[PDB]
């Protein structure tokens, strides 16, 4: 007791620490559980742990921490009794319905692990009494749970269970949820339903004919999910169910006719061209009859059938313009549509899919009246449709008149906008990019509007004003007005001192698009005055300002190195080297990219001293990014400049400077692909000391050098240095820790292609069997990787003689 009650205390203290505890506390207690999970009784682990998850006081944060523990224990113990299976399904099962897909996925990993742990037989015995439940919620849950189990264990093993529930005459809800299981199985497997669809079809067909309507509807939705997930192939099976859908459509009306038209509508694109024409023309009558249906469901289905039928070749586009289209636009573009999003998406996408058959000028023609409507959120939807339609079809169809009215409505609806959205930018941009040469007579007022909007007091309208310039700059070059480029660039450079960062970044982006396009010498400010006004901006903190500023400065580094004096460039370097403490990634990547531009601009040796001075800092981001910077400098200005300086720097006694030296060398090797050959020979005595050194970090990082060196230096004909390097590596095979061992293994694999498969194998065959169960476990891994890289390449190299193995091969000893 008192000895084992101490264990009962340890599990409680641990679980407490994970749920409510410090970060470094729970982080270690997780390790303690994962390593000690086998020695604690799963009766005690789950018996203690599960009661926590039932109460309502737990937050999502504290809940996921317990969930993670459940997953880590289940994946280990490997065998579990059925009561705990039922409990874990009671806790984990509700997660599949949760509001956000993260909780869905993490609750899904539980059941997909338990399905393997608990095995096939147990879970099915747990579900059988559950499907019969009178509750709606539980049945809803374990439909999804049952599907997750189905994908996890394969569907065929669980199929006769579904057949039993579906075909069961005993209970009705068993039929219902037994049919829903086919829904979520169809969803999870995706296209992979396919081969199983016949077996699944054993359920649906007869289960469709139940006297109760809510089953008849569920089967209709299953036919839709299977029909869409299948795609064209599945036709041959659905022919058996194709007949009753028609005797169901022509009668039941109401909410059922919606479901059956969803089914048949989803069946259309997989039908042969002969039948497609028939079944479409049959469906279109009911569609037109049902236009006035107030029900959201039925409208949603109508948009589906119109959505699919346009792809059918039988119906002609003239047939659509004469009849279906005008009845479409007037009914489904009513401003009451624009208020609810889920139906907005469907109407817009339906119009877009109709744009293929219909004329582009016809679709856009019907879409100009909604653009000129007064309602703002309605004009927004009217924008979305034009955006996606123009993206697909292009502007080549448009006559000058529609081309004028469209852009007019886009200017108007552009200037009154409220919410922040790119749909105008892209869309109003997608227009410009398409018709750009034809844009010229319209370009003068547009820019003027921008020049007004920049002076507006609201920050959003200033964002949206600056953003639209960056899209126009390329088409403004195509329209040849350079004076407008200069006038813009001047006005932006004057507005460049704005307070609000979110607008200022966009301003600098427009500056970027202007500078890349226009002739460098003709820029008014000019660049030489531009840059010293940029250098204080790098300290603006935030992010977007930093990102856009850095990319722009890099653009200057490419195009205009000679203007700013080298001392100013050094100010830039000292600001960036400080700036890359930023938490964001692209900030650091862009910064490191700019060091190549500056090192090319001014010189390598003035930058390198500054970088190497920064490797003495404790933080890891700084050291690693300065390593990448040294790599890029070595690439752009050549390795012969950087290599002696770095090899000198490696002599320092400090650890972090040495590791940084090795890493910077890794990057500078992977950046120059072929070169790499002249430079080895010098660095093998540098790797000599790295692979020898006591701590496990040098031996790790140096092997990474050996990977990038041996891969692209192979076949060059050195090969006497790689034998040396290998002779230094092989003893490291026994080393533990994940990071060193993966880098060492990668190193041996790279050296396999420098030495060759046989010359590399001569080391391994020895301990490839061996008594020691460990040396064996270590070498079979390298033999695995070598076998994956080489199968017929190792064939001459096996250590096999006629008396070494029983059969051998009699034909290897033949000589002619």
């Amino acid at each position: 007791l008192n000895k084992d009650e101490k264990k009962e205390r340890t599990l409680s203290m641990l679980l407490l620490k994970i749920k409510n505890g410090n970060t470094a506390s729970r982080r270690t207690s997780m390790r303690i559980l994962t390593d000690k999970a086998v020695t604690f009784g799963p009766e005690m682990i789950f018996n203690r742990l599960l009661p926590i998850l039932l109460d309502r006081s737990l937050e999502d944060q504290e809940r996921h921490l317990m969930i993670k523990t459940i997953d880590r224990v289940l994946y280990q113990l490997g065998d579990l009794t059925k009561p705990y299976v039922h409990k874990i399904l009671v806790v984990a099962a509700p997660l599949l319905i949760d509001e956000d897909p993260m909780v869905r996925s993490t609750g899904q990993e539980i059941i997909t692990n338990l399905s393997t742990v608990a095995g096939l037989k147990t879970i099915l015995t747990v579900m059988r009494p559950d499907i019969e439940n009178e509750d709606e919620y539980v049945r809803n849950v374990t439909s999804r749970a049952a599907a997750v189990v189905a994908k996890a264990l394969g569907v065929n093993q669980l199929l006769p269970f579904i057949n039993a529930a579906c075909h069961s005459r005993k209970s009705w809800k068993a039929r219902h949820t037994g049919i829903k299981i086919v829904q979520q199985i169809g969803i999870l497997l995706g296209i992979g339903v396919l081969n199983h669809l016949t077996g699944l079809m054993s359920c649906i067909k007869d289960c469709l004919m139940d006297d109760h309507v809510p089953v008849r509807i569920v089967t209709a939705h299953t036919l839709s999910t299977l029909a869409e997930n299948s795609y064209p192939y599945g036709i041959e099976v659905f022919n058996v169910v194709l007949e009753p859908l028609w005797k169901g459509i022509r009668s039941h009306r109401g909410k059922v006719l919606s479901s059956f038209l969803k089914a048949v509508g989803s069946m259309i694109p997989l039908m042969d061209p002969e039948y497609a024409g028939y079944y479409t023309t049959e469906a279109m009558r009911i569609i037109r009859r049902e236009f006035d249906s107030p029900d959201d469901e039925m409208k949603k289905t109508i948009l589906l059938v119109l959505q699919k039928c346009s792809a059918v070749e039988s119906i002609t586009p003239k047939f659509l313009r004469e009849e279906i289209a005008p009845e479409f636009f007037q009914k489904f573009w009513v401003r009451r549509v624009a208020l609810d999003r889920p139906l907005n998406k469907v109407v817009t996408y339906t119009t877009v899919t109709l744009a293929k058959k219909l004329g582009c000028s016809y679709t856009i023609d019907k879409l100009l009246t909604p653009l000129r409507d007064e309602a703002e959120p309605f004009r927004t939807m009217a924008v979305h449709a034009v955006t996606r339609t123009v993206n697909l079809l292009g502007t080549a169809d448009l006559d000058e008149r529609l081309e004028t009215r469209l852009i007019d409505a886009l200017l108007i609806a552009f200037q009154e906008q409220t919410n922040s959205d790119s749909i105008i930018f892209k869309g109003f941009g997608a227009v410009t990019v398409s018709l750009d040469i034809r844009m010229k007579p319209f370009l003068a007022p547009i820019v003027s509007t921008i020049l007004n909007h920049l002076k507006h007091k609201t920050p959003l309208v200033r964002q949206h004003a600056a953003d639209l310039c960056a899209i126009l700059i390329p088409v403004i070059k195509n329209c040849h007005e350079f004076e407008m480029l200069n006038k813009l660039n001047i006005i932006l450079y004057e507005s460049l001192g704005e307070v609000y960062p979110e607008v200022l970044g966009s301003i600098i982006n427009a500056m970027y698009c202007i500078t890349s396009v226009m002739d460098l010498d003709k820029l008014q400010p000019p660049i030489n005055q531009i840059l010293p006004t940029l250098t204080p901006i790098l300290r603006n903190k935030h992010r977007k300002v930093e990102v856009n500023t850095i990319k722009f400065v890099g653009l200057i580094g490419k195009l205009a190195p000679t203007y700013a004096p080298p001392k100013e460039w050094m100010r830039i370097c000292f600001e960036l080297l400080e700036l890359l403490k930023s938490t964001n990634k692209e900030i650091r990547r862009s910064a490191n990219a700019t060091f190549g531009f500056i090192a090319e601009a001014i010189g390598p040796h003035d930058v390198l001293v500054a970088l190497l001075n920064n490797l003495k800092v404790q933080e890891r981001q700084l050291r690693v990014c300065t390593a990448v910077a040294i790599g890029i400098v070595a690439k752009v200005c050549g390795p012969y400049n950087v290599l002696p300086v770095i090899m000198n720097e490696y002599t320092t006694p400090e650890t972090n400077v040495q590791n940084g030296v090795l890493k910077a060398m890794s990057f500078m090797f992977e950046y120059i692909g072929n070169m790499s050959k002249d430079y080895i020979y010098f660095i093998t005595p540098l790797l000599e000391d790295a692979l020898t050194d006591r701590d496990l970090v040098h031996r790790q990082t140096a092997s990474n050098v050996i990977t990038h060196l041996a891969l692209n230096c192979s076949g060059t004909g050195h090969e006497d240095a790689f034998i040396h390097l290998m002779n230094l590596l092989i003893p490291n095979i026994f080393e533990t820790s994940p990071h060193a061992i993966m880098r060492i293994l990668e190193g041996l694999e790279a050296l396999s292609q420098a030495l060759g498969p046989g010359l590399f194998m001569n080391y391994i065959w020895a301990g490839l069997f061996h008594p020691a169960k460990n040396v064996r476990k270590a070498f079979w891994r390298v033999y695995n990787n070598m076998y994956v890289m080489y199968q017929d390449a190792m064939v001459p190299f096996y250590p096999v003689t006629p008396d070494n193995n029983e059969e051998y091969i009699e034909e290897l000893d033949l000589v002619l």
Binding site: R31, D35, V800, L814
Partner: protein, 84 residues
């Protein structure tokens, strides 16, 4: 922990794709069978090493040597030759 548990999984996958991969304990027979299959596949695959085996064995046709090599991959093929 989780890393090793991925190592086992990729082990099971690559052992399926590439057939023979030694894990830790593999019997000498289990490994020598893989060696035999690789060697025979090289002998048959390259038309060079197939010409060499065909002329050396003096068989009447190339296809006889190739099918001889394929058949040799089954264990019972030795005994089958002995019953002739």
């Amino acid at each position: 922990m989780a890393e090793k548990q991925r190592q086992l999984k990729l082990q099971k996958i690559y052992k399926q794709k590439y057939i023979g991969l030694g894990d830790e304990s593999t019997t000498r027979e289990q490994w020598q069978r893989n060696v035999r299959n690789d060697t025979l596949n090289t002998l048959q695959g390259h038309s060079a090493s197939l010409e060499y085996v065909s002329l050396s064995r003096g068989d009447l046709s190339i296809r006889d040597t190739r099918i001889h090599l394929l058949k040799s991959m089954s264990p019972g093929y030795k005994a089958y030759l002995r019953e002739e």
